Design an enzyme around this catalytic site. Structure first.
Site, PDB file in Angstrom:
ATOM      1  N   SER A 167       0.798  -1.220   0.000  1.00 11.14           N
ATOM      2  CA  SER A 167       0.000   0.000   0.000  1.00 11.14           C
ATOM      3  C   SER A 167       0.833   1.274   0.000  1.00 11.14           C
ATOM      4  O   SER A 167       0.262   2.362  -0.153  1.00 11.14           O
ATOM      5  CB  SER A 167      -0.905   0.043   1.226  1.00 11.14           C
ATOM      6  N   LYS A 214       0.321   4.219  -2.335  1.00 12.17           N
ATOM      7  CA  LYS A 214      -0.825   5.118  -2.241  1.00 12.17           C
ATOM      8  C   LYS A 214      -0.404   6.521  -1.815  1.00 12.17           C
ATOM      9  O   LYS A 214      -1.075   7.499  -2.157  1.00 12.17           O
ATOM     10  CB  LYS A 214      -1.867   4.553  -1.264  1.00 12.17           C
ATOM     11  N   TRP A 234     -10.763  -4.161   2.324  1.00 12.65           N
ATOM     12  CA  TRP A 234     -10.120  -3.022   2.984  1.00 12.65           C
ATOM     13  C   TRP A 234     -10.387  -1.720   2.232  1.00 12.65           C
ATOM     14  O   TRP A 234      -9.484  -1.053   1.714  1.00 12.65           O
ATOM     15  CB  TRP A 234      -8.627  -3.247   3.241  1.00 12.65           C
ATOM     16  N   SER A 278      -5.556   3.801   3.965  1.00  4.59           N
ATOM     17  CA  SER A 278      -5.047   2.805   2.979  1.00  4.59           C
ATOM     18  C   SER A 278      -6.219   2.201   2.172  1.00  4.59           C
ATOM     19  O   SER A 278      -6.193   1.054   1.842  1.00  4.59           O
ATOM     20  CB  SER A 278      -4.225   1.745   3.677  1.00  4.59           C
ATOM     21  N   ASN A 306      -8.482   0.693  -0.346  1.00  7.98           N
ATOM     22  CA  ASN A 306      -8.091   0.056  -1.604  1.00  7.98           C
ATOM     23  C   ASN A 306      -8.974   0.492  -2.762  1.00  7.98           C
ATOM     24  O   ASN A 306      -8.470   0.764  -3.858  1.00  7.98           O
ATOM     25  CB  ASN A 306      -8.141  -1.464  -1.475  1.00  7.98           C
ATOM     26  N   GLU A 327      -4.036  -7.226  -6.587  1.00  2.00           N
ATOM     27  CA  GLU A 327      -3.088  -8.102  -7.277  1.00  2.00           C
ATOM     28  C   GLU A 327      -1.641  -7.710  -7.010  1.00  2.00           C
ATOM     29  O   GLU A 327      -0.756  -8.574  -7.008  1.00  2.00           O
ATOM     30  CB  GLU A 327      -3.368  -8.111  -8.777  1.00  2.00           C
ATOM     31  N   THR A 336       2.000   3.491   5.297  1.00  2.00           N
ATOM     32  CA  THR A 336       2.283   2.084   5.529  1.00  2.00           C
ATOM     33  C   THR A 336       1.991   1.249   4.282  1.00  2.00           C
ATOM     34  O   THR A 336       1.292   1.675   3.358  1.00  2.00           O
ATOM     35  CB  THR A 336       1.392   1.566   6.658  1.00  2.00           C
ATOM     36  N   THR A 358       1.238  -3.227   3.633  1.00  2.00           N
ATOM     37  CA  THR A 358       1.231  -4.589   4.164  1.00  2.00           C
ATOM     38  C   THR A 358       0.744  -5.528   3.074  1.00  2.00           C
ATOM     39  O   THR A 358      -0.441  -5.522   2.738  1.00  2.00           O
ATOM     40  CB  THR A 358       0.333  -4.685   5.395  1.00  2.00           C
TER      41      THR A 358
HETATM   42  C1  LIG Z   1      -6.293  -6.828   2.957  1.00  4.98           C
HETATM   43  C2  LIG Z   1      -5.493  -5.801   3.751  1.00  4.98           C
HETATM   44  C3  LIG Z   1      -5.417  -4.526   3.275  1.00  4.98           C
HETATM   45  C4  LIG Z   1      -4.722  -3.554   3.927  1.00  4.98           C
HETATM   46 BR1  LIG Z   1      -4.758  -1.923   3.031  1.00  4.98          BR
HETATM   47  C5  LIG Z   1      -4.053  -3.865   5.132  1.00  4.98           C
HETATM   48  C6  LIG Z   1      -3.282  -2.956   5.940  1.00  4.98           C
HETATM   49  C7  LIG Z   1      -3.098  -1.520   5.630  1.00  4.98           C
HETATM   50  P1  LIG Z   1      -1.435  -1.135   4.956  1.00  4.98           P
HETATM   51  O1  LIG Z   1      -0.459  -1.484   5.957  1.00  4.98           O
HETATM   52  O2  LIG Z   1      -1.318  -1.913   3.647  1.00  4.98           O
HETATM   53  O3  LIG Z   1      -1.375   0.186   4.641  1.00  4.98           O
HETATM   54  C8  LIG Z   1      -2.723  -3.470   7.102  1.00  4.98           C
HETATM   55  C9  LIG Z   1      -2.875  -4.769   7.411  1.00  4.98           C
HETATM   56  O4  LIG Z   1      -2.328  -5.320   8.519  1.00  4.98           O
HETATM   57  O5  LIG Z   1      -3.545  -5.532   6.663  1.00  4.98           O
HETATM   58  C10 LIG Z   1      -4.127  -5.137   5.581  1.00  4.98           C
HETATM   59  C11 LIG Z   1      -4.857  -6.124   4.913  1.00  4.98           C
END
Ligand SMILES: Cc1cc(Br)c2c(CP(=O)(O)O)cc(=O)oc2c1
Ligand SMILES: Cc1cc(Br)c2c(CP(=O)(O)O)cc(=O)oc2c1
Ligand SMILES: Cc1cc(Br)c2c(CP(=O)(O)O)cc(=O)oc2c1
Length: 269
Positions: free
Chosen positions: A46, A49, A81, A106, A108, A144, A211, A213
């Site tokens: 992410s 972004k 998310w 974050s 999506n 993806e 962040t 993840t």
């Molecule tokens: C499916 C999903 C999407 C995101 Br968007 C996250 C994030 C936010 P980020 O860290 O990517 O910004 C943290 C997380 O622990 O799990 C996620 C699971």
């Protein structure tokens, strides 16, 4: 010199983690830097972004009213998310609200809708090339781009390139002054990074971060601008990945790596 002050603790930290940690930290006052695996590619997850919102802000410099444009979307836009955009499905959101949701939550669906407006992954990559970043590449959409396959260069950058680009966008001249402050303000309001770089930063310092993840291959990250009191800001990026698909990421490792980077720069905190 400073890269060697912390080389040994970084190796022990990543060995305990069971993967690879990539760090680049820059003291914008002296120009001093700390590097550890700073030229290796890591998945963006992410973290793209943040750069996406900067690209939107850059476009708004010569397309007034872009930020106020309402965007309407269907249920099929709502991928996992999307905590903000799912609440405005029946109403739509503006480009600025999508950008804030992408940066601060974050979101999506918000990220994908903004990618659409900018011409997809190649359009964001083109923006990064326009500011002098030849390492960044975005190739795919959410979700993806989270595959984080070992050795795959798609949807990756390096910690050094992330830090250099972040510096240009938040402190340098890549954005005009009002757009730059808006980008900083969005990063400062991020809600998803309390356990990462921010966990390494004292309460009386300002910090903005984004962040990422990926959820596989122990792959997660954070980049930040930190404003210590009484000295010039620090820009840093902390990226991780691990060899096995089922390896878990660790926020505590990201915080610990940020602490070592700040210790290496001599930043007391
Ligand atoms: C499916 C999903 C999407 C995101 Br968007 C996250 C994030 C936010 P980020 O860290 O990517 O910004 C943290 C997380 O622990 O799990 C996620 C699971
Ligand atoms: C809003 C939007 C637009 C596109 Br153009 C995509 C794509 C490309 P496609 O694989 O669907 O063709 C993938 C995706 O997950 O989300 C999108 C969201
Ligand atoms: C998404 C995006 C935004 C911008 Br603002 C650019 C720019 C700057 P411009 O000279 O086109 O106005 C160059 C580019 O190659 O790609 C971009 C992609």
């Amino acid at each position: 010199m400073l890269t060697n002050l912390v080389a040994e603790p970084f190796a022990k930290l990543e060995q305990d983690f069971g993967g690879s940690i990539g760090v680049y930290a820059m003291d914008t006052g002296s120009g001093a830097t700390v590097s550890y695996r700073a030229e290796e590619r890591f998945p963006l997850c992410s973290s793209f972004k943040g750069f996406l919102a900067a690209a939107v802000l850059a476009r708004s410099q010569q397309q007034a009213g872009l930020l106020d444009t309402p965007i309407r979307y269907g249920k099929n836009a709502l991928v996992p998310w999307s905590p903000i955009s799912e609440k405005y499905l029946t109403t739509g959101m503006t480009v600025a609200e999508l950008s804030a949701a992408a940066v601060q939550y974050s979101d999506n669906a918000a990220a994908n809708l903004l990618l659409k407006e900018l011409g997809g992954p190649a359009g964001l990559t083109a923006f990064m090339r326009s500011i002098g970043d030849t390492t960044f590449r975005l190739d795919r959409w959410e979700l993806e781009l989270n595959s984080a396959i070992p050795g795959d260069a798609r949807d990756t950058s390096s910690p050094r390139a992330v830090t250099e680009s972040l510096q240009k966008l938040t402190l340098g001249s890549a954005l005009a002054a009002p757009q730059r402050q808006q980008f900083v303000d969005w990063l400062k309001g991020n809600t998803t990074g309390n356990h990462r770089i921010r966990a390494a930063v004292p309460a009386d310092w300002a910090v903005g971060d984004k962040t990422g993840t990926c959820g596989v291959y122990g792959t997660a990250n954070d980049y930040a601008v930190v404003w210590p009191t009484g000295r010039a800001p620090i820009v840093l990026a902390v990226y991780t990945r691990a060899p096995n698909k089922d390896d878990k990421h660790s926020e505590a490792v990201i915080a610990a790596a940020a602490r070592l980077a700040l210790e290496g720069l001599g930043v007391n905190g």
